[PDB]
Design a protein around this ligand. Structure first.
Ligand SMILES: [Zn+2]
Lengths: 60, 206, 98, 113, 80
RNA sequence: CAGGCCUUGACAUGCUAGGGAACCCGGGUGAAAGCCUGGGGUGCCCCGCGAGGGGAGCCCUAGCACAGGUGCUGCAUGGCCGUCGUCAGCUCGUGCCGUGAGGUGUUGGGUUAAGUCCCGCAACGAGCGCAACCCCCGCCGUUAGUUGCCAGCGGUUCGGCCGGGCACUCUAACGGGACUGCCCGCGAAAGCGGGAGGAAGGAGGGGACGACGUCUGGUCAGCAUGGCCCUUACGGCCUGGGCGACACACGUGCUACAAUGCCCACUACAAAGCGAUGCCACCCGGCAACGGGGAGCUAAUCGCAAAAAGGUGGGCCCAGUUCGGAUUGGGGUCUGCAACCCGACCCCAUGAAGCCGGAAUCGCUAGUAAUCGCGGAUCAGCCAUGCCGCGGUGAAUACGUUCCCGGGCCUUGUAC
């Protein structure tokens, strides 16, 4: 989660396959989801803070 | 331990989302990212004004930002110039003709975030922790506010050992859904590290 | 012959918008098919509550989309101009297809 | 520290209005200035401690009327500040509490100027 | 393995050097880092110093080893 | 980790000099990264007839504040989480007792999942707790009928296919309903046994919800932050290797050891999801994975999608076997710049161990265990037999608390 690593993911790496996904909030690349572009921790925090429209605690 | 977020527990009922808009999977991420950026910029800037809440609305290729402030005098300025440049800033950041709005919070003693930042500033100014907490809880209790609770994290008075202080009075039923408990967290930075302050305020039922 | 799509995250505002549209159309001459409820779509996200370990925590979150349908029949010109003019609530999303 | 009801009486005897401005000298903690801000329009404070100032910076955070000037009361151009800050108020009062030793010289200066 | 439609893959930077060396006399100990390339009939009988991870190991190209890859003849882990 | 490179720089905010002042395409050396070196360029104002300039954003060079660090400290911290434990307990106000520390409440009898409730009682309450308020499943009703459905009609090239209709299922929103509510009997009451009406009967079945605190619990490698440490290196850029090694041991699982079975054909019945640089119907080539053509779908319409155990017919006849498919040799396909280390899948070839498993030990009380299949996240592809969900078939047994483990409350001896 080094800075240099953060900017390294924002350039076309000469081939398609080298490209990947980083969290847009903390720069994690271990639990990021395509839909939100956030890691699980950031997703949970933002969901709890109520800053995600329509996202709510699930129970069934 | 490990109590859950009191706001996230009541998203469905008695509390409402901060961001209110619809977007498909195609463009959810972009809208969320720009919303986060807007919130970051506004929280960085308007801190002096006593920020409460930032509501983001979208209708059709446009953004309607509502800002809850203790004292609108700071945000607006001497003849409504400050807001203008502020608007321009957002207009420069995301080119979708945002429409800034300001709302003043009635009796600022009944807003958990404001109490949070107040106590955080007190901590930052090397105040006495316990006395400040009692004062804060009493002040909240004076203005109705059927319940009040304030918690400080640790590292009290630059000590070597961290410890929670905690103080409350009134009814704070964290376990009931129909509670409408307002929640606020603030972080204080001092020469000897970081402190976390949490404030819950209980206002009626149903 | 005109179909009206209502998509939302909050069912209450969606119902309010659908009610407004149906009422306005009904006032404006010709009859309508009426609000047709559609099966809501659910996305689910299971995460670990902990930031490091304890993979037995797994808090849940859901994102649900609610759907409507209006299907105005026998379109009227002044009815048409009545549409695209009424300001919709912020959360609700509208679509028009013939 | 003084009883909270007496200060009300002094402020009443100042016949403070929502339109008038006040110059307050030596707020200290900031009892007086608080009970002014309410009924007053613009409060200016000349105060030099750096010790009770954090307390004072806090106590006045609610209000937007009060302002603090970190300048010597005696080593100040009172004309300059009075014209600069108060371009809007109709009338101006001065209500303060003085710290014994230097009480006569301040009043003498304000009157001779 | 290979799709057999797009042909056997060989690095251009190595193939070019091999062919030009073939055309003009001979040279020994051609150092390379390509672990991915495949043996071709155009470099049979030569020697390649392939980088296995710490130092180039010499490998002598025979006829029989035509169908295989460069790197497999270069050990990557030393046991005992 | 080995090797080859760079030093206000991969990234941010500011000064002092010069300038080719947004910069646009080539050539060498190389594994690239880089290092040099070529041709066309000024795209904004003011000024000066113009020539020239006064200047902007604007990239280079040299220096300045600097940035940067997955370096150390989780025994300096925030935040977040785990466990005791969803155990039932932890306190306060006023009043009473005692000179006081303090006690009562919170003890005693009974009953609950529960400090749940009743009675007694010098206490009456209240707060955080439990319960309830919230969500799903189960019955019914009112608005609403398209992409859903088809009972009664007319056609149908007989498939809801058309015309047609919201009766029924469904689909969503709002409500009703369960409250020991009615009766008999037993108790001083909380309650208990048995009935009736009801879809459901005595917290209807699950979920979300974690008290004051304990464990100097876990995380400085999500993030934020205090103090030390490095800044031609502990920073940064590329190639290759490694994280996947292997005399051995341990944990969690998958597939089996067969006849309640195995294999091959035909035929049925689900839910919950996902998909526009994706799903991919159908036709053709190939035994095949797949390739070529090629409609339709921002989706109750189209597709993934074949559901599998199940049923019917045929074969196998106790054999390391038509059990099992490990291991190994070839031939291919797909993704990807690139399948040796180290991908998946297809076809041919071979066919290991394994005859129900010591001491010991785990899970489960009903739609549960056991058993069968499907979907999603991530994802170019995938080592996923993992994780989170969905449905199909569907049991056995609880006499009792002696003993094993772990808790709660009430009683007694020696230290703070
Ligand atoms: Zn993150």
């Amino acid at each position: 989660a080094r800075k240099a690593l953060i900017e390294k993911a924002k350039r076309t790496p000469k081939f398609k396959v080298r490209a990947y996904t980083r969290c847009v909030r903390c720069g994690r690349a271990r639990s990021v989801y395509r839909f939100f572009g956030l890691c699980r921790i950031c997703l949970r925090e933002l969901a709890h803070k109520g800053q995600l429209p329509g996202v709510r605690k699930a129970s069934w | 331990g490990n109590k859950i977020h009191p706001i996230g527990f009541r998203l469905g009922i008695t509390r409402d989302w901060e961001s209110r808009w619809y977007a498909g999977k195609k463009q959810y991420r972009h809208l969320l990212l720009e919303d986060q950026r807007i919130r970051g910029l506004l929280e960085k800037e308007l801190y002096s004004a006593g920020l409460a809440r930032v509501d983001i609305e979208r209708a059709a290729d446009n953004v309607a930002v509502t800002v809850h402030v203790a004292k609108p005098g700071v945000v607006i300025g001497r003849g409504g110039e400050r807001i203008r440049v502020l608007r321009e800033e957002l207009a420069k950041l995301t080119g979708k003709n945002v429409a800034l709005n300001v709302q003043e919070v009635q009796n600022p003693n009944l807003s958990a975030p404001l109490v949070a930042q107040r106590v955080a500033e007190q901590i930052e100014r090397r105040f006495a922790v316990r006395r400040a907490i009692k004062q804060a809880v009493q002040r909240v209790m004076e203005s109705g506010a059927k319940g009040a609770k304030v918690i400080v994290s640790g590292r009290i008075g630059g000590a070597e050992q961290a410890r929670t202080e905690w103080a409350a009075q009134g009814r704070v039923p964290l376990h009931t859904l129909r509670a409408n408990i307002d929640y606020g967290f603030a972080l204080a930075r001092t020469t000897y590290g970081v402190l976390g302050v949490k404030a819950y305020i209980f206002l009626g039922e149903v | 012959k005109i179909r009206i799509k209502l998509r939302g995250f909050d069912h209450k505002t969606l119902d309010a918008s659908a009610q407004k549209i149906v009422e306005a159309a009904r006032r404006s001459g010709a009859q309508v098919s009426g609000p047709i409820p559609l099966p809501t779509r659910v996305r689910r996200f299971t995460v670990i509550r902990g930031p490091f370990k304890h993979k037995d925590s797994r808090e849940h979150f859901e994102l649900r989309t609610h759907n409507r349908l209006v299907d105005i029949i026998n379109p009227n010109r002044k009815t048409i101009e009545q549409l695209m003019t009424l300001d919709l609530p912020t959360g609700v999303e509208i679509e028009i297809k013939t | 520290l003084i009883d909270t009801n007496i200060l009300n009486r002094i402020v009443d005897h100042a016949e403070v209005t929502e339109k008038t401005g006040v110059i307050e000298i030596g707020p200290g903690i900031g009892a007086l200035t608080e009970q002014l801000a309410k009924r007053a329009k613009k409060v200016v404070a000349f105060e030099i401690d750096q010790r009770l100032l954090p307390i004072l910076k806090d106590t006045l955070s609610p209000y937007e009327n009060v302002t603090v000037i970190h300048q010597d009361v005696l080593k100040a151009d009172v004309k300059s500040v009075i014209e600069e800050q108060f371009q809007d108020c109709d009338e101006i009062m001065v209500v303060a509490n003085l710290p014994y030793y230097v009480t006569t010289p301040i009043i003498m200066k304000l009157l001779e100027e | 393995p290979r799709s057999l439609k797009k042909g056997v893959f060989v690095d251009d930077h190595l193939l070019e050097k091999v062919l030009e060396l073939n055309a003009k006399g001979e040279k020994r100990l051609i150092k390379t880092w390509s672990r991915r390339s495949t043996i071709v009939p155009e470099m049979v009988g030569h020697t390649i110093a392939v980088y296995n991870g710490k130092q180039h190991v010499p490998v002598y190209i025979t006829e029989n080893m035509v169908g295989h890859k460069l790197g497999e003849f270069a050990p990557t882990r030393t046991y005992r």
